[PDB]
Design an enzyme around this catalytic site. Structure first.
Site, PDB file in Angstrom:
ATOM      1  N   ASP A 286       0.803  -1.222   0.000  1.00  0.00           N
ATOM      2  CA  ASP A 286       0.000   0.000   0.000  1.00  0.00           C
ATOM      3  C   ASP A 286       0.835   1.271   0.000  1.00  0.00           C
ATOM      4  O   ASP A 286       0.539   2.229   0.711  1.00  0.00           O
ATOM      5  CB  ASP A 286      -0.932   0.067   1.196  1.00  0.00           C
TER       6      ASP A 286
ATOM      7  N   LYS B 272       1.920   4.800  -0.938  1.00  0.00           N
ATOM      8  CA  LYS B 272       1.267   6.036  -1.408  1.00  0.00           C
ATOM      9  C   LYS B 272       1.651   7.160  -0.461  1.00  0.00           C
ATOM     10  O   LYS B 272       1.989   6.899   0.690  1.00  0.00           O
ATOM     11  CB  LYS B 272      -0.247   5.954  -1.496  1.00  0.00           C
TER      12      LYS B 272
ATOM     13  N   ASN C  62       0.565   7.393   3.192  1.00  0.00           N
ATOM     14  CA  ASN C  62       1.059   6.450   4.200  1.00  0.00           C
ATOM     15  C   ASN C  62       2.505   6.742   4.593  1.00  0.00           C
ATOM     16  O   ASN C  62       3.076   5.923   5.324  1.00  0.00           O
ATOM     17  CB  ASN C  62       1.032   4.997   3.715  1.00  0.00           C
TER      18      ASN C  62
ATOM     19  N   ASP D  52       0.894   2.244   8.167  1.00  0.00           N
ATOM     20  CA  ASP D  52      -0.253   1.474   7.747  1.00  0.00           C
ATOM     21  C   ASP D  52       0.147   0.150   7.105  1.00  0.00           C
ATOM     22  O   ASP D  52       0.293   0.081   5.878  1.00  0.00           O
ATOM     23  CB  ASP D  52      -1.160   2.228   6.773  1.00  0.00           C
TER      24      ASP D  52
ATOM     25  N   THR E 255      -4.347   0.488  -3.422  1.00  0.00           N
ATOM     26  CA  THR E 255      -5.018   1.737  -3.760  1.00  0.00           C
ATOM     27  C   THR E 255      -5.004   1.835  -5.290  1.00  0.00           C
ATOM     28  O   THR E 255      -3.933   1.586  -5.857  1.00  0.00           O
ATOM     29  CB  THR E 255      -4.375   2.931  -3.049  1.00  0.00           C
TER      30      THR E 255
HETATM   31  C1  LIG Z   1      -8.366   0.721   7.749  1.00  0.00           C
HETATM   32  O1  LIG Z   1      -8.580   1.389   9.030  1.00  0.00           O
HETATM   33  C2  LIG Z   1      -7.759   2.358   9.464  1.00  0.00           C
HETATM   34  C3  LIG Z   1      -8.071   2.983  10.640  1.00  0.00           C
HETATM   35  C4  LIG Z   1      -7.294   4.006  11.068  1.00  0.00           C
HETATM   36  C5  LIG Z   1      -6.199   4.305  10.316  1.00  0.00           C
HETATM   37  C6  LIG Z   1      -5.867   3.651   9.155  1.00  0.00           C
HETATM   38  C7  LIG Z   1      -4.658   4.070   8.459  1.00  0.00           C
HETATM   39  C8  LIG Z   1      -3.360   4.212   9.275  1.00  0.00           C
HETATM   40  O2  LIG Z   1      -2.779   3.209   9.669  1.00  0.00           O
HETATM   41  N1  LIG Z   1      -2.816   5.401   9.566  1.00  0.00           N
HETATM   42  N2  LIG Z   1      -1.741   5.656  10.430  1.00  0.00           N
HETATM   43  C9  LIG Z   1      -1.450   6.902  10.547  1.00  0.00           C
HETATM   44  C10 LIG Z   1      -0.304   7.199  11.482  1.00  0.00           C
HETATM   45  C11 LIG Z   1      -0.163   8.553  11.765  1.00  0.00           C
HETATM   46  C12 LIG Z   1       0.825   9.045  12.632  1.00  0.00           C
HETATM   47  C13 LIG Z   1       1.720   8.184  13.257  1.00  0.00           C
HETATM   48  O3  LIG Z   1       2.672   8.682  14.096  1.00  0.00           O
HETATM   49  C14 LIG Z   1       1.571   6.854  12.981  1.00  0.00           C
HETATM   50  C15 LIG Z   1       0.592   6.337  12.086  1.00  0.00           C
HETATM   51  C16 LIG Z   1      -6.661   2.629   8.668  1.00  0.00           C
END
Ligand SMILES: COc1cccc(CC(=O)N/N=C/c2ccc(O)cc2)c1
Lengths: 337, 20
Positions: free
Chosen positions: A153, A155, A158, A171, A188
């Protein structure tokens, strides 16, 4: 040596993969401050660990939503793989736990925000700027692929920018440990390799394709295949015909023709010499791979830091109360989390 | 221009994952 380091990496990884960390914190240990991003199953919030004062990013997944979207096995993959890896450009998982309603992954807080944000605002990145980011992804993919992991994934959404301007991959929802071939249609749309779309069975070469998509998007300001609907995007990808901005250098175009290659016997990263085809390409001639790894290269871009819990490099999101049921949901399904 | 076409498109915001 690259060899030595990776072998050492694999031993470290395999012990954790075979005996994963589980239930290493509790929700009440964290003060929840603000949403940093959202996703299909929930949200990630800035939190503060009460006994240390340390900030982290807490990903909260609603078990029932995971189940509805038939993402149970993928979520198990995500957490098992993330707790086992360790690489300078991978976001670190610090704690994980679950309760009656949700699964929680408490990760390092990367305060510079998403590459997506900076790319859209600035328009496009210079070739040296794109190259600095691209190098980190090349090393990260060498690392992951050496562990038989496919990321699936890539992109700018992420990729988070740390306080020193280096990338942190986030992610791991589609990450998978697979020897050989797999078939799931996930990713994606703009980033999918043709063999994913054509249901051919695929392997780690899809991450190198996606690197091509990312470098293009970084250097152009738009992806190589876009449309208003995913079906039209897929048509464009399988066509495989790529046009380049007039400002793209000759070396950049050559690299991308080799990454955005439909033919797997010709796609870079997937040949006898593997990742070295990329590392030794002319576009990367100025890159010091070891110094990128050692974080000794000056970043082209350093984010604003107005203080430890500051979130000004992130967009605002609608907040909601984190309600935990009084009845356990989906216990059997997520037993190994 | 291609840039203008992208900026007028509906996919300049965050892009969701496809599960299938
Ligand atoms: C599919 O369901 C989902 C639910 C919530 C989030 C996500 C996506 C994700 O993992 N974002 N992480 C951001 C991140 C931002 C800041 C950081 O210090 C670490 C990670 C998918």
């Amino acid at each position: 040596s690259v060899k030595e380091f990776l072998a050492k990496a694999k031993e470290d990884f395999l012990k954790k993969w075979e005996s994963p960390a589980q239930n290493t914190a509790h929700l009440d240990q964290f003060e929840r401050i603000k949403t940093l991003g959202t996703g299909s199953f929930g949200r990630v919030m800035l939190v503060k660990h009460k006994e240390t004062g340390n900030h982290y990013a807490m990903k909260i997944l609603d078990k029932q939503k995971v189940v509805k979207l038939k993402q149970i096995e993928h979520t198990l993959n995500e957490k098992r793989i993330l707790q086992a890896v360790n690489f300078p450009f991978l976001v670190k998982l610090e704690f994980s736990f679950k309760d009656n309603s949700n699964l929680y992954m408490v990760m390092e807080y990367v305060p510079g925000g998403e590459m997506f944000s900076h790319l859209r605002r600035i328009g496009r990145f210079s070739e040296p700027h794109a190259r600095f980011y691209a190098a980190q992804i090349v090393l990260t993919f060498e690392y992951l692929h050496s562990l038989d992991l496919i990321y699936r994934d890539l992109k700018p959404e992420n990729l988070l920018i740390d306080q020193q301007g280096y990338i942190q991959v986030t992610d791991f929802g589609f990450a998978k440990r697979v020897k050989g071939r797999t078939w799931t249609l996930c990713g994606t749309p703009e980033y999918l390799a043709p063999e994913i779309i054509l249901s051919k069975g695929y392997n780690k070469a899809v991450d190198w394709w996606a690197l091509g998509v990312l470098i293009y998007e970084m250097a152009a300001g738009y992806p190589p295949f876009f449309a208003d609907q995913p079906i039209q995007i897929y048509e464009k990808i399988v066509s495989g015909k790529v046009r380049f901005p007039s400002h793209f250098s000759s070396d950049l175009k050559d690299l991308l023709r080799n990454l955005l290659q439909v033919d797997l016997t010709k796609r870079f990263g997937n040949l006898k010499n593997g990742v070295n085809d990329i590392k030794n390409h002319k576009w990367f001639a100025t890159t010091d791979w070891i110094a990128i790894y050692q974080r000794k290269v000056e970043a082209p871009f350093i984010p604003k830091f107005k203080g430890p819990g500051d979130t000004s490099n992130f967009d605002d999101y609608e907040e909601e109360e984190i309600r935990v049921s009084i009845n356990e949901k989906c216990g059997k399904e997520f037993s190994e989390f | 221009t291609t840039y203008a076409d992208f900026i007028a498109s509906g996919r300049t915001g965050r892009r969701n994952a496809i599960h299938d």
